[PDB]
Design an enzyme around this catalytic site. Structure first.
Site, PDB file in Angstrom:
ATOM      1  N   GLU A  49      22.707  48.896  41.465  1.00  9.42           N
ATOM      2  CA  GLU A  49      22.557  50.330  41.117  1.00  9.42           C
ATOM      3  C   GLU A  49      22.547  50.439  39.590  1.00  9.42           C
ATOM      4  O   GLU A  49      23.568  50.122  38.973  1.00  9.42           O
ATOM      5  CB  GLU A  49      23.683  51.152  41.746  1.00  9.42           C
ATOM      6  CG  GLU A  49      23.372  52.638  41.799  1.00  9.42           C
ATOM      7  CD  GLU A  49      22.244  53.025  42.738  1.00  9.42           C
ATOM      8  OE1 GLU A  49      21.620  54.069  42.485  1.00  9.42           O
ATOM      9  OE2 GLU A  49      22.005  52.290  43.732  1.00  9.42           O
ATOM     10  N   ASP A  60      28.948  61.913  35.219  1.00  4.90           N
ATOM     11  CA  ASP A  60      29.646  60.658  34.877  1.00  4.90           C
ATOM     12  C   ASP A  60      30.966  60.956  34.172  1.00  4.90           C
ATOM     13  O   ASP A  60      30.980  61.777  33.224  1.00  4.90           O
ATOM     14  CB  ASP A  60      28.718  59.751  34.070  1.00  4.90           C
ATOM     15  CG  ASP A  60      27.687  59.091  34.966  1.00  4.90           C
ATOM     16  OD1 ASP A  60      28.116  58.286  35.821  1.00  4.90           O
ATOM     17  OD2 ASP A  60      26.479  59.429  34.844  1.00  4.90           O
ATOM     18  N   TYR A 175      24.892  57.281  50.381  1.00  2.17           N
ATOM     19  CA  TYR A 175      25.962  57.111  49.374  1.00  2.17           C
ATOM     20  C   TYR A 175      27.165  57.941  49.817  1.00  2.17           C
ATOM     21  O   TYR A 175      27.160  59.155  49.670  1.00  2.17           O
ATOM     22  CB  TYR A 175      25.472  57.489  47.979  1.00  2.17           C
ATOM     23  CG  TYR A 175      26.301  56.959  46.837  1.00  2.17           C
ATOM     24  CD1 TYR A 175      27.611  57.362  46.652  1.00  2.17           C
ATOM     25  CD2 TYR A 175      25.740  56.159  45.864  1.00  2.17           C
ATOM     26  CE1 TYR A 175      28.386  56.893  45.603  1.00  2.17           C
ATOM     27  CE2 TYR A 175      26.503  55.669  44.811  1.00  2.17           C
ATOM     28  CZ  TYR A 175      27.823  56.060  44.658  1.00  2.17           C
ATOM     29  OH  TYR A 175      28.562  55.613  43.597  1.00  2.17           O
TER      30      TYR A 175
END
Ligand SMILES: C=C(/N=C/c1c(COP(=O)(O)O)cnc(C)c1O)C(=O)O
Ligand SMILES: c1ccc2[nH]cnc2c1
Ligand SMILES: c1ccc2[nH]cnc2c1
Ligand SMILES: c1ccc2[nH]cnc2c1
Ligand SMILES: [Cl-]
Ligand SMILES: [Cl-]
Ligand SMILES: [Cl-]
Ligand SMILES: [Cs+]
Ligand SMILES: [Cs+]
Lengths: 253, 394
Positions: A49, A60, A175
């Protein structure tokens, strides 16, 4: 191509989980990044990834925020990232390669054009961090037109309509993040689940597979080993090799 | 699935990580519920009237238009409690947070006006408030910082990226993902993901509604145009909303031209940027050829933002509203002119709107025109900045 399907078929034959590291492309530089990535694969990564550095990575935490700044400090651009991806694929024909993108880098030069470039360099999947299923149609259509799996996050605050949508819309893998989420996703014929919620120890990999996940995604733990060892490239590679060896061993059982 | 349209034509949407979608859906339902609840409306009106001081004056500016056929009114949002229009919608959003059973508030600020407004509202209504602000912004806005802390707010400087309003914006969404069961994100402009552009418009629309009633009372007709500065779009959409269906009324939005559009140091994405996806929305952005978000520039911290609310992008596209720019030097001249000729010290943000009205008058001084400028804030916060420029040029 069918790189995720082939990998899961081969792993299911081996009664084996996937271990998938996340790293930022060009962190801490283009040449060191290419060495880091070859080290993860050699050490037993089943898939990759790969983040593309973005000015405003709002999804993030600070570990990866710092990884992007390190890559911008080395002048890393999206075009340089596509050159890197073509080189990685040329060395490594079967490993599934997934990108972690922000919507503006996909939309910038035209969504179709972005996915066409991904297909040309041999990328397998794209997770667009800031495109929820509700906004996903033009991205998922362009992905599938270019043989790219669109990847969706199934959050812990998911409900049944979201599970049906992720199961229908996603490809390659789901995911992830009671974890009966996994059984409903299987009921709805979703792409195999990879658990990605702060996977940083071997026991978490074993536990993901025991839950009925097809494997686990680390990411942050890998970038942390890069951050720690900036001043020692060959200690960086030694600690990365040891970490990935340990996480991959945990997936066989 | 949503109760309301998240788009204005092709602009807007909900471009957030999946984990934030339930927070946005919860906020939309609470808003739709509140707008049909006379008790919510009554509590909001009470705070606007008795706490914030609404209605605000509409001031006729005779000296500045002498010898022309321009009649100019200023909508006095500078007289609102806190000294800017930001107060109006913070009071509505703080009441929504309480309707949702939330006890905590997150807010971003650049200039510090929205941060001050969020901290005052949180003090009044018993909410625990934290304010993300560019470390660059914290170091330049120690007054507004100290005010926020006096009112019991936590001010969190941001080290991330350019360490500024977009990173402050970046920081606030970062936080809300985890806290939204307990905390409401008090977004300070008519931008970001649905439903914020809609909510902020509806909680600012009293500006235009009052302006329409006051100009009918004073002049017996609608204005020829209403003019407002555009940072993210809240004071302008607040003034514009009640006139959108009055097709004779011009809607003029003024973006910051900074050192000049041709320098690239400006904050005028609507006319000089290009569409992108960032801060939860599809909207005009200042961005690099590669799609990295650019840094904007303006002398005015409150306009220094590289995007714009999606309803302004839409109104522009269909030709309902026109958007122009005003440079730092034009804004400073308008600031000095209002102080000297009307005894009002305007915010440098608002001075952009005034500067464009002065241009409309001076370019065509025998054109009969009835104009309203939204005076979004007072300029006490800007006197150090103006002092520092006047010393430098003389
Ligand atoms: C960005 C901020 N201020 C914006 C502002 C603006 C521009 O924001 P809107 O486009 O949302 O009205 C206009 N006028 C005044 C007096 C302002 O303080 C802030 O206070 O954080
Ligand atoms: C890997 C790395 C960063 C991410 N941000 C959102 N999803 C991610 C997966
Ligand atoms: C698109 C357009 C109008 C809508 N009304 C409610 N949801 C919508 C979505
Ligand atoms: C533009 C962007 C964000 C903002 N927060 C408060 N005012 C703003 C203007
Ligand atoms: Cl298995
Ligand atoms: Cl599927
Ligand atoms: Cl009426
Ligand atoms: Cs006049
Ligand atoms: Cs702007």
């Amino acid at each position: 191509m069918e790189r995720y399907e082939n990998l899961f078929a081969q792993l299911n034959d081996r009664r084996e989980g996937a271990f998938v590291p996340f790293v930022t492309l060009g962190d801490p530089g283009i040449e060191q990044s290419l060495k880091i990535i070859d080290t993860l694969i050699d050490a037993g990564a089943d898939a990759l990834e790969l983040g593309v550095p973005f000015s405003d990575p709002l999804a993030d935490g600070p570990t990866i925020q710092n990884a992007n700044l390190r890559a911008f400090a080395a002048g890393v651009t999206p075009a340089q990232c596509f050159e890197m991806l073509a080189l990685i694929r040329e060395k490594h024909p079967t490993i599934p390669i997934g990108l972690l993108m922000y919507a503006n880098l996909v939309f910038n030069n035209g969504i179709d054009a972005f996915y066409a470039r991904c297909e040309q360099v041999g990328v397998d999947s794209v997770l667009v961090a800031d495109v929820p299923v509700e906004e996903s149609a033009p991205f998922r259509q362009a992905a599938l037109r270019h043989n790219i799996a669109p990847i969706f996050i199934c959050p812990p605050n998911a409900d049944d309509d979201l599970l049906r949508q992720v199961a229908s819309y996603g490809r390659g893998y789901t995911y992830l993040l009671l974890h009966h989420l996994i059984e409903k996703l299987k009921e709805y014929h979703a792409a195999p689940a990879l658990q990605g919620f702060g996977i940083s120890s071997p026991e978490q990999v074993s536990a993901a597979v025991r839950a009925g996940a097809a494997g686990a995604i680390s990411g942050s733990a890998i970038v942390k080993i890069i951050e720690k060892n900036l001043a020692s490239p060959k200690q960086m590679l030694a600690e990365l090799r040891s970490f990935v060896s340990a996480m991959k061993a945990a997936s066989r059982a | 699935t949503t109760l309301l349209n998240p788009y204005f034509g092709e602009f807007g949407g909900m471009y957030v990580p999946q984990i934030l979608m339930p927070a946005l859906n919860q906020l939309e339902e609470a808003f739709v519920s509140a707008q049909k609840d006379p008790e919510f409306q009554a509590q909001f009106a009470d705070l606007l009237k008795n706490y914030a001081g609404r209605p605000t004056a509409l001031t006729k500016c005779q000296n500045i238009t002498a010898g022309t056929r321009t009649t100019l009114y200023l909508k006095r949002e500078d007289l609102l409690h806190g000294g800017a229009h930001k107060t109006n919608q913070v009071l509505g959003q703080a009441l929504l947070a309480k309707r949702m059973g939330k006890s905590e508030i997150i807010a971003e600020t650049g200039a510090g006006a929205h941060g001050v407004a969020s901290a005052l509202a949180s003090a009044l209504l018993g909410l625990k408030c934290r304010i993300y602000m560019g470390a660059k912004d914290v170091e330049r806005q120690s007054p507004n910082v100290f005010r926020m802390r006096l009112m019991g707010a936590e001010v969190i400087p941001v080290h991330s990226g350019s360490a500024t309003l977009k990173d402050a914006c970046n920081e606030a969404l970062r936080d809300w993902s985890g806290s939204y069961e307990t905390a409401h994100y008090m977004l300070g402009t008519a931008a970001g993901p649905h439903p914020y552009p809609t909510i902020v418009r509806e909680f600012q629309r009293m500006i235009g509604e009052e302006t329409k009633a006051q100009i009918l009372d004073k002049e017996g007709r609608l204005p020829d145009a209403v003019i407002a500065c555009v940072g993210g779009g809240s004071n302008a959409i607040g003034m514009f909303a009640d006139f959108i269906n009055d097709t004779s009324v011009g809607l003029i939005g003024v973006e910051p031209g900074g050192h000049g559009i041709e320098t690239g140091e400006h904050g005028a994405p609507l006319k000089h940027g290009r569409v992108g996806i960032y801060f939860g929305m599809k909207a005009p952005m200042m961005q690099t050829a590669d799609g990295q978000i650019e840094e904007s520039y303006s002398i005015s911290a409150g306009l220094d933002f590289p995007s714009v609310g999606p309803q302004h992008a839409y109104l522009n596209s269909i030709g309902r509203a026109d958007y122009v720019s005003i440079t730092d030097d034009e804004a400073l001249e308008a600031f000095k002119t209002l102080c000297r000729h009307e005894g009002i010290i305007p915010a440098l943000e608002s001075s952009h709107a005034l500067a464009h009205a002065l241009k409309m008058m001076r370019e065509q001084p025998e054109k009969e025109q009835l104009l309203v400028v939204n005076l979004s804030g007072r300029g006490d916060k800007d006197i150090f900045t103006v002092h520092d420029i006047l010393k430098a040029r003389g």
